[PDB]
Write a protein that binds this ligand. Structure first.
Ligand code: OGA
Ligand code: MG
Ligand code: NI
Ligand code: ZN
Length: 331
């Protein structure tokens, strides 16, 4: 068995190997990369996502989200308070202000210490989930707006044509902006490209040990667990590495820098934080190996998780028994 300790693997494809996206994912899996839940892909030195980032300031962040925490430093939830619209140029200036900027630090490990110690005492503002793309249309390799769609994968594997579309999303972050512990919708893959700015630190639990993380979360968030049998689908709960180590949960960590891709694998729980002003682009995707994970994915039916149009068909075809109850949650 390849990669039996489930370590995060890092890949350095040549320009030739960067042509065929599906083939390279399958290669990474042949080496055991999925066992970690997360992999890093450093693009060939010849590749670029676009020529410059000099003209992005007029993108609108229609609904910036202030991430307000409750709990203790290592075990907390966050809620998202909607703020007034602002442009990317306005948000970058805000991120760089004395109130929100990254503090002085020695290295990534010192910054990580400061994040876990102090996150809860501040409320950073995240421009998340903004439909669009920063890939130049002429970038032909690993262009997250030109991937094969999940609907076409389901049709190729299972023969059933379904409605729905699959487009990328932009994330504009600042110091302390936080992504809570989750897997993807329908336990899909995700791919995330850090276009510019400061790093993003990731934590991940191997897919084979995901249920250990779920059992800890039910113990640590006991009211949320009674409210919903899949409450991590709400994407609000944080648990620190120190707490995970104290409770024997297997995980790994890695820092992504500008110019790098990360891939999350089906049922790979992940969480993390931004180091400073940055912009990332991400999208879900599928491969043939996903189909069995899609069929087994948990679902929130309490009404909190509220998701895309396109998830309807995935539930309806892969999980017909759950469909009725899940759709009640969506309506
Ligand atoms: O970058 C973020 O805030 C969150 N991204 C992801 O969870 C991802 O790409 O799957
Ligand atoms: Mg612009
Ligand atoms: Ni994710
Ligand atoms: Zn729920």
């Amino acid at each position: 068995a390849q990669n039996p300790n489930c370590n995060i693997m890092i890949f350095h494809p040549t320009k030739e190997e960067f042509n065929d996206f599906d083939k390279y994912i399958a290669y990474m899996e042949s080496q055991g990369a999925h066992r970690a839940g997360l992999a890093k892909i450093i693009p060939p030195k010849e590749w670029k996502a676009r020529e410059t980032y000099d003209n992005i300031s007029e993108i609108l962040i229609a609904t910036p989200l202030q991430q307000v925490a409750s709990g203790r430093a290592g075990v907390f939830t966050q809620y998202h308070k909607k703020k007034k619209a602002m442009t990317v140029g306005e948000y970058r200036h805000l991120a760089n202000s004395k109130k929100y900027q990254t503090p002085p630090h020695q290295n990534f490990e010192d910054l990580e210490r400061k994040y876990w110690k102090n996150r809860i005492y501040n409320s950073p503002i995240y421009g998340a989930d903004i439909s669009g793309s920063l890939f130049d249309e002429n970038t032909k390799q690993w262009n997250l707006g030109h991937l094969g769609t999940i609907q076409d994968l389901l049709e190729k594997e299972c023969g059933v044509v379904i409605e729905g579309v699959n487009t990328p999303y932009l994330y504009f972050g600042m110091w302390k902006t936080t992504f809570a512990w989750h897997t993807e919708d329908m336990d899909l893959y995700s791919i995330n490209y850090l276009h510019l700015g400061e790093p993003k630190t990731w934590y991940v639990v191997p897919p084979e040990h995901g249920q250990r993380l779920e059992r800890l979360a039910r113990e640590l968030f006991p009211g949320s667990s009674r409210g919903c049998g899949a409450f991590l689908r709400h994407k609000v709960a944080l648990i620190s590495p120190t707490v995970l180590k104290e409770n024997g949960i297997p995980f790994n960590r890695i820092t992504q820098e500008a110019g790098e891709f990360m891939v999350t694998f089906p049922y790979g729980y992940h969480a993390g934080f931004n180091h400073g002003f940055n912009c990332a682009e991400a999208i879900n995707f599928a491969t043939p190996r996903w189909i069995d994970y899609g069929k087994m994915a948990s679902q929130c039916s309490c009404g909190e998780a509220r998701v895309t149009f396109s998830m309807d068909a995935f539930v309806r075809i892969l999980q017909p028994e759950r469909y009725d109850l899940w759709k009640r949650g969506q309506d």
